Amino acid sequence: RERIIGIPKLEDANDAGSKYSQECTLILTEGDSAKTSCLAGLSIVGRDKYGVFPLKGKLLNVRDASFKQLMDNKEIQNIFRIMGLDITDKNKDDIKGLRYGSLMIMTDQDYDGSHIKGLLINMIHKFWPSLLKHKGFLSEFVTPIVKVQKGSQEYSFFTIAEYEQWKENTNLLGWKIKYYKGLGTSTDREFKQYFSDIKNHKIMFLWTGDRDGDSIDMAFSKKRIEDRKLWLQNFILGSYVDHKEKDLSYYDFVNKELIYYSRYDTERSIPNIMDGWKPGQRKVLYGCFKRNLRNECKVAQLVGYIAEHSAYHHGESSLQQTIINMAQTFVGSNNINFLEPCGQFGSRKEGGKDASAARYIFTKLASSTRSIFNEYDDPILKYLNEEGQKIEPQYYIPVIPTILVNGCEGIGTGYSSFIPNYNYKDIIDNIKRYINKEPLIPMVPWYKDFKGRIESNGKTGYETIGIINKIDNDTLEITELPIKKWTQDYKEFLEELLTDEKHQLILDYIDNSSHEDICFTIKMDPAKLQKAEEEGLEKVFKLKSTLTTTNMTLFDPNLKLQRYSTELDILKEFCYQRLKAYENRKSYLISKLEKEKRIISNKTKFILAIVNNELIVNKKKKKVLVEELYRKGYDPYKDINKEEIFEQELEDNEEIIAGITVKDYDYLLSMPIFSLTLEKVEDLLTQLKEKERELEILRNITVETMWLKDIEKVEEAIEFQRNVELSNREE
Amino acid sequence: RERIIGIPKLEDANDAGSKYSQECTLILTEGDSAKTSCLAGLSIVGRDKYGVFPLKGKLLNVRDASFKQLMDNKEIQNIFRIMGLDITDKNKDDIKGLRYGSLMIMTDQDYDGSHIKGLLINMIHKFWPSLLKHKGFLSEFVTPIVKVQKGSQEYSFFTIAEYEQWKENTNLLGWKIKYYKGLGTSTDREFKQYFSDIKNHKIMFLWTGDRDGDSIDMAFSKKRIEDRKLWLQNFILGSYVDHKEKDLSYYDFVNKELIYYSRYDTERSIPNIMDGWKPGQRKVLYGCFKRNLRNECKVAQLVGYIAEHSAYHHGESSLQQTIINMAQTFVGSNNINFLEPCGQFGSRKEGGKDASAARYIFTKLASSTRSIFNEYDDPILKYLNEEGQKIEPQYYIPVIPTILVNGCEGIGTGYSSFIPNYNYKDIIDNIKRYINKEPLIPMVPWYKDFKGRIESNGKTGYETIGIINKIDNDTLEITELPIKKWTQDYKEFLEELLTDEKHQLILDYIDNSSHEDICFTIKMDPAKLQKAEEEGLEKVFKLKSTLTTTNMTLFDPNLKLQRYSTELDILKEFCYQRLKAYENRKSYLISKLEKEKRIISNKTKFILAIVNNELIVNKKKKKVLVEELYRKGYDPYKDINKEEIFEQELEDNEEIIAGITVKDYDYLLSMPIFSLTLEKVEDLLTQLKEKERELEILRNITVETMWLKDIEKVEEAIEFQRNVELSNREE
Incomplete structure (x- = not known):
């Protein structure tokens, strides 16, 4: 029967190219490793109907690609031969006589994998757009995103949202939790289980109109860049594909999954x-x-x-x-x-x-x-x-x-x-002006240890200028370069001036620039030097650079790309956010101090009671002592310990009464015997007075005072760091 | 004056190529980073007499190199231009008129840097051997290997041996310690200090006869490989260069420094x-x-x-x-x-x-x-x-x-x-024979899950054979490949059999091999199949591989390369060493148990004394309590804690009497108040009886019993791991 010659990596289905071709599925995997896992799966399902071909890296973007690139691309040419498809016959609306009747894309559940699924859809849409409309033609392999375990009762969640809903409503015991973003995470045994229940590990792509095609072209076309920018800007930050659904439209895949890859480089x-x-x-x-x-x-x-x-x-x-x-x-x-x-x-x-x-x-x-x-x-x-x-x-x-x-x-x-870089002092006086409702002052770009000039160009930004001096009628000296012109590049530029392709502008130069200072001495024709002086030496020797301020683009505090017109707009947004952050810090510190105070109060009572012979611990049964601590009014820790949960951060627990365990009082029982000694008792007593004074002071402090105080510390720290850099520099 | 045109990376000395050329030194650095550090140094010494050129990667080995490789090598051609040297004039014995009168090699104090120094010496010896004999011509930049600090009194050690002698004879307080193997470790400021005292950071290479040249040729020649093997074998494992010396012979550099690079790849x-x-x-x-x-x-x-x-x-x-x-x-x-x-x-x-x-x-x-x-x-x-x-x-x-x-x-x-791989069971019965002075049995190579045959070839080793069966007169099936013939390579081999360049040996094949099993079905001309049967199917289809046992080469327990004739020689050496290791383990465990017992005994006494009201801790001044613990016979920890020192693993310490501090008794004072409760006291009491029984049992156990017991545990663990692999494999 039909067979493929030139493709060693192909695991052709036994019935591909046969009269059973429509029943066959070709699986495209992300890498050889995925193909090996797939063969582990196929040892269950059999090899008559399933073929496997491994994609290497990322598929070519056919939409933008030249004809020569397409012909030259062996991976794509191979995929065409394996399928029995080719470019000349577009408009094909039927699944015959293709070597395979279905295509399944198998990738990591991550951005690169999504990008690969998109590239494959892109190719199919570009050459056989008709094929996407054909139902059941393209599917995607899907595994559970998260698997959880407690003894028995193992659950598998296809959607993160489903897992979050379970997590929120459950105490993670001792539940063991694993995420499955990459294919490599799954064992060969697990692959056998997915293929044992393949219908429940397959999502079928659905065409829902011409918007699907427009979506694919918008994502991949060289000519839709602005549409792409609008698309990226209008993105809704909670967006996700619902894997619970057996079906996924191309438009939903592009808008709610591919977009994550599309916006990642900007991120x-x-x-x-x-x-x-x-x-x-x-x-x-x-x-x-x-x-x-x-x-x-x-x-x-x-x-x-x-x-x-x-x-x-x-x-x-x-x-x-x-x-x-x-x-x-x-x-x-x-x-x-x-x-x-x-x-x-x-x-x-x-x-x-x-x-x-x-x-x-x-x-x-x-x-x-x-x-x-x-x-x-x-x-x-x-x-x-x-x-x-x-x-x-x-x-x-x-x-x-x-x-x-x-x-x-x-x-x-x-x-x-x-x-551009700015002076921290100018920034700090703008912050103080923001605190005092005083007008903000525009800032000029400032660079540490730069010896040249920075001045407005009047239009798009600022210009930085190095230093060049006339030594005598034959000699020039350069002692500073403009910002970001590296010494070696400049030296190469002077050397190119020496050659006739640049009209022998200079006779000779000596470079004694150090690791951090600039020293070029230049010898010139006196008439050439004079003409250069008339042209302007800085211009002739290219000692100016431009700091453009028209594209100050940043992610805003809400994770959305913005262009800020001036440094003041950036400063104002930062100040608004920072002032709120100080309110959040204050409330957090107050809650922490209240918790620390309560812990201290319990330890103070516990130590004093033992030291004053009111509480007896020696040779007391532990459950008896825990019962007594509870009855006498000591707080078990969980009552003081009122917090997002991260999975990887996870004398018996036998309930004495009513819900109390021995562990509940460990924070007291754990304290070293040394705590009972005199100085230690005295310090413990000191601790509560200090904790309440600190709490009272915190309660009445304003956010402006907290910020202003921190700014004071920042000014001292920056100045100390700079002074150390200068002291190190000196002989 | 003289100047260099084509070499942007060169930092030419001002007086190079001048009438002062003999006074100039050219510094060759390992990389651009080293050159930048060097310019930091030269901002002290000046730029009139010192030139700098950065070596990229590793210099060509000129000794083995073809003429075309030498001409084509821009880095070497550049070095020749910078120096004013060239190949045609060998035999040169004078330092004039070279652009520079001295060459200094600056590298990391590590194997790669040593290899670079050697490559440069190799080049000079090959083209101008006369130049090496010329005194002061080649030197090497050296920094201290280790710098130590305590407040003031900063020391710098040029030799590790010197540092070890200081370390052995000193309590590392609080001494702060830094090693300086790479050049990058040093700051620009530190480079300024080295160049401030350059004589004390320079080692001069010395020629001490024709043995130096023979040493260099032995190290780098294509024809001296066996001499190199002898040289590597006869190496003395303590060997090191004495950096305290202002001079270093080429022979000592090759034999005691370069050799470390030379033997590293084998390591x-x-x-x-x-x-x-x-x-x-x-x-x-x-x-x-x-x-x-x-x-x-x-x-x-x-x-x-x-x-x-x-x-x-x-x-x-x-x-x-x-x-x-x-x-x-x-x-x-x-x-x-x-x-x-x-x-x-x-x-x-x-x-x-x-x-x-x-x-x-x-x-x-x-x-x-x-x-x-x-x-x-x-x-x-x-x-x-x-x-x-x-x-x-x-x-x-x-x-x-x-x-x-x-x-x-x-x-x-x-x-x-x-x-080759061997059966752990055969290994274990050889170990038991070694313990019992029974003759050891030669072992046949064994591979887990291999289904084919392994048999002696009678001469050099063993042969592994896959499985191929006749299905009918037209059809062959392969269900096992020889050891280490991967499925994809074999599939490519069958495909090449399909093509006429291999005379159309087979008509067709289907490959349904899984991720771990082998299934090739092959269709042949019936007459071709019969002839192949006569030739032998395993030979025709290349289903045999060879396990050669004549080159079993390993580092011996003393870190010296050896070739072991058989697997029994390896086993015997291992058994001798392992039996000694059991004596060392026993002595160590006994010493540890004695220390644990002493700690328990002190805690038992301390807890009982508090619990029985003999020792009062409540509201007792700490120094008073520490004095009382010492007077009453409690061991301070340092008396129980009798240990190679690794640098990066590093109520007051005020001496009460005589040498005792509060920290000395922390192991007692630290114990939680919970230790005084009844169950905890009972367990503490239990602990000493258990510790002495365990110690007594350990004292009288033989090494053979310890080994035999561990072997028992190993057999159980291997079998459990294997059973889990098999259970996972099953449906």
Whole structure:
């Protein structure tokens, strides 16, 4: 019968290309690993009707692709041969005589997998749009998103929303919980179970009109970019596909699933207004806070720790670089570095490219970082949950808007952003003006250790100018470059001036620039030098750069991309949010202090009672003592301990009365015998007075006073960090 | 004056190529990062006399290189132009008129850096051997290996041996300690200090005769491989270069420093006899034990943890693969996997290549692993120290020789090894024969779940044969492949049989092989099939593979490469070492039990005394109570706590009398008030009787009984793990 010659990776169904072709299904998998799991499944269902072909990487986007790219693309050519399909016959509306009568796409339940499903739908729509309208033609393999276990009574949830509804309404015992985003997570045995019940692991794509086609073209066409921008902007942040449904329209897949891939690159490339962090940097800072990185560690070790605790998925090279960039201090990088560069982290010579290997450089939190990112704020942030692990928050809320301090430069596709560096002092006096209802003052971009000029160009932004001086009639000297022109690039530019392709503008140059200062000495024809002076030396030698302020694009506090017209608009939004964050911090601290006070009060009573011989513990049966603590009015811990739940963060519990266990009083019984000694008793007594004074003071403090006080600490910390940098610089 | 045109990365000295050329030094650095640090140094010394050029990666080995490779090599051509040197003039004995009069090599103080220094010396010796004899021509930049601090009194050690001598003779307070292997570890400020005192950061290479040249040629020549093998074998394991010396001969550099790079690849590629582990796998197992990986975690998270805690430096891709390979269970991989494959870890189809992404697969210690690698052995192993961090041991000592269970295949250059898999049951009965002075029985290679035949080839080893059957006169069926012939490769081979380049041996084939079983059905010309039967079907269809036993090469227990003639020689050496390890474990456990008993005895006395009203703690001043505990005969902890020191593992301490502090008795004072309750007192009393019985039993047990008992547990664990694999396999 019919057979395929040139495709070793194909696991052709026995009946493909036969008179049973309509009954056959071809499974397209994301990778060879998925194909191997699929063959484990097919050892159940059999190999007569199911074929398997592994997709490598990501399918070509046929919609934008040139004809030559299409012919040259072996993976797509192979898929065409395997199906029995080809381009010349479009308009085909029937499933005969194809080698297979159905196509099933099997991928990870993640953004890349969704992008792959979309690319396959894109190809089918582009070449045989008729085929999508044909019912039962395209399906997708689906496994449960979450599996839970308690002894017996095992549940499997297809939808996260379903799992959340179960989780909210259940005490997680001891329930064991596993997420199944990737196909690799499933064992071969589990694949056998899915294929044993394949109907319940299959979702059929449904065509619901021309909007489906318009959706696919909007997603993948080179000409629909603005429609795509509108589509991304109008996205509803709760949107998700309901896997409980046996059917899924193409329009719903594109709008409620593919969109997550489509918007992911913008999410990676553009920082949030609130902390100025892109998500990867935020993962790094979160990792540093979690371990409390106050002492040096190797960057490579930090890379391993962040990869484990922050769920960073873009590889060690990007992670290394992200940490390094967060530690750089050279001209044109960070105004305030939040990681310390303990070693060679690169320089202005190559714009940080000249950083040393991660294995030998150390880093730690910079001395100012915990004042700026005040730890009292940590508990009021919203932390993301990935497959049950508690990872980095949606954003940090620093005391000052760090986004203005260090700026940003981002390019994804379809969105970019640039924000200049600014003086933290100008930022702080704008904050004080915001607190006092005083008019805000526009800020001029400012760069630490830059010696040149920054001035408005009057239209789109600002210009930075380096320093060049006439030494004598033959000689020029350059002692400063414009912002972000690295020394090595400039040196190459002077060398190209030496060659005739640039008309021998200069006779000679000596470069004695250091790692951080600029020293070029240039020799010229005296007449050429004079003419260059008339043209303007800065222009001739290209010593100006432009800081454009017309595209200050950030994610807003509600996770929505915005363009801010000026630095003041950014500052105002930040101030409104930050002032609210101070109200949340105050309420949280009050609730925490009340809980601490109650715990102290119980310990004080317990210790005094033993020490005054009112309470006898020696040789007392434990249940008798717990009963006595309960009867005498001691709070079991659960009454004081009134909190989002992250799955991976999870003398008997036999109820004495009424609901009390021994563990309920561990916070008292656990206290060391040393607590009964005199100094310890005295300190314990001291503790409650101090706790109530601290609570009373907190109750009456305003948010403006809390902020103003933190700003005071931030100014001191920044100045100390800077003074240390200067002291280190001096001989 | 003279100047260089085509080399942007060059930082030419101002006086290079001038009449001052002899006074100039050219610094060759390992990378751009090193060059940037060097310019930080030169901002002190000035730029008139020092030039800097960054080496990229590793210099070409000119000795083996073809002429075309030499001409084509821009980095070397550039170095020649910068120096003013070139090939045509060999025999040059003078330093004029070179652009620079001295060459200084600046690298990391690690194996790769040493290899780079060697490559540069190799080039100079090959083209201008005369130049090496010229004194002061080649030097090397050296920083202190270790810097220590206590307040003031900062010391810097150039030699590790010097640092060890200081460390042994000093209490590390509170001393802060940093290693400086890589150049990147040093700040720009530190570089300024080294260049402020450059004479004390420079070592001059010295030529001491023709042995130096012979040393360099032996190290780098294509024709001296056997001399290199002898050189590697005769290495003295304490060997090191004395950096205290201002001079270093080429022969001493090659023999005592370069050799570490030279032998490193063999160290990476060939396992130790004792645990069957290559160092990277051993780092993985060590990491798993340290966190006690009894619950599943993502492989990518495990990768991050191992990278932090085991000092793995070969990148995430290799680390991922190492973990995955340690979890594989398919035919031809591990007889006993010590990591569990919780997900898709690959199959026989592609020999494990078809493993899923690290982000979505989970692993944990396999159920048998802690019985085989008995944790009681952990404290008696020798753990390596890297830059103050405690990492993986020299080797583990398992209960059985795992190297025979899972075999190995290693290729470095100049050494390779192959060991087949063996049946653990055969291994265990050989161990019991070793214990009883009974003759050992030769073992035949055995592979879990393999259905074919394994038989001696009579000469070099064994042969494994797959299964092929005649179905009828036109049809053959293959239901088993030989060991390590992956299904996909074999399928490609059948497809090539279909084509005329292989004379149309077969008409057709169907492949319904699963992820783990083999099913090829083949259609043939009946006459061709008969002729093939006469030739022998196994031979025609290539269903045999060879297990060669003539190159069983391992590191011996003393860290020295050996070739073992048979599996019995390996077994005997392992048994001798393991029996000694049991003596060390017994002595360690006895010492630990004696310490635990003493601690219990003190707690028992302390609790009874309080509970019986002999000792009063309530409202007693702490120093008074500590004085009373000391006077009444309680042991301060330091008297019971009698231990190699790893740097990164580091009510007042005011001496009451005579040398006692409050902390000395924390182990008593720390005990919870709950210890005074009745059940807790009763259990405490129980604890000492149990501790002395356990100690008495341990004192009189023989090593053979301890081993035999552990072997019993190992047999149970392996059988349980296997039964779970089989139960999972069943429908």
